[PDB]
Amino acid sequence: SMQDPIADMLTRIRNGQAANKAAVTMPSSKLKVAIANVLKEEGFIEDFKVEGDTKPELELTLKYFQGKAVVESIQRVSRPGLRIYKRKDELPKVMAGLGIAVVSTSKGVMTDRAARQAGLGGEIICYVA
Amino acid sequence: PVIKVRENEPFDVALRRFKRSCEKAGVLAEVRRREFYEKPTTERKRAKASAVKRHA
């Protein structure tokens, strides 16, 4: 079954990157949307479009800098079978801050740096490189 | 492979025809196949091999 949606989305993104897909679409979710937004902010995709009313499709437009993928890697750290929650002090950094950790925090989904700045952490949703 | 020589027809020709008919039937081959028992597995393997061969 579709037992992790975020993970699935990440995988899709990665696959798109691999195969030179201009866009990558999937079933949208609020968390998913947030993640997409975060990614956009950080710089790894162009734009996301949540198209539909009853069944909304999240459609991410992937970037390709100099004929290769921007998303070098995109791993779920937290996952349904083993969740990973980091305190502010514990909070990770992907490639020594040359790459982001999407963390879900009490004040929204955001990159790890942002969380740190705030003075909080939480469920480290995914490392994006 | 039932044959009968028609009116004004050589023996040799008739024989040839009969042979052809037999070949078409696959009688000798069939007999050979039934001379000894092949295990179902073995038969399957043979079939597979044949299939492979056919893929040229």
């Binding site: - | 492979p1 039932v2 008919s21 078409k24 039937a25």
Partner: protein, 65 residues
């Protein structure tokens, strides 16, 4: 070239021996699909029909009796 398909038949008839006995050889054996060019489903149906005929003794099993 499959004839049955062209015709547009739902099922081959065992009673129609004239059609069937083109698809069985002189000895009485059922002719291959690869030779006759019959569709696979049709071929199976045809075979079944032939069998039925044989049972009822319209076609022969073999050319002995």
């Amino acid at each position: 070239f499959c004839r049955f398909t062209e015709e547009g038949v739902q099922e081959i008839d065992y009673k129609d021996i004239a059609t069937l006995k083109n698809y069985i050889t002189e000895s009485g054996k059922i002719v291959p699909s690869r030779i006759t060019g019959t569709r696979a489903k049709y071929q199976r149906q045809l075979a079944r029909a032939i069998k039925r005929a044989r049972y009822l003794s319209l076609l022969p099993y073999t050319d002995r009796h």
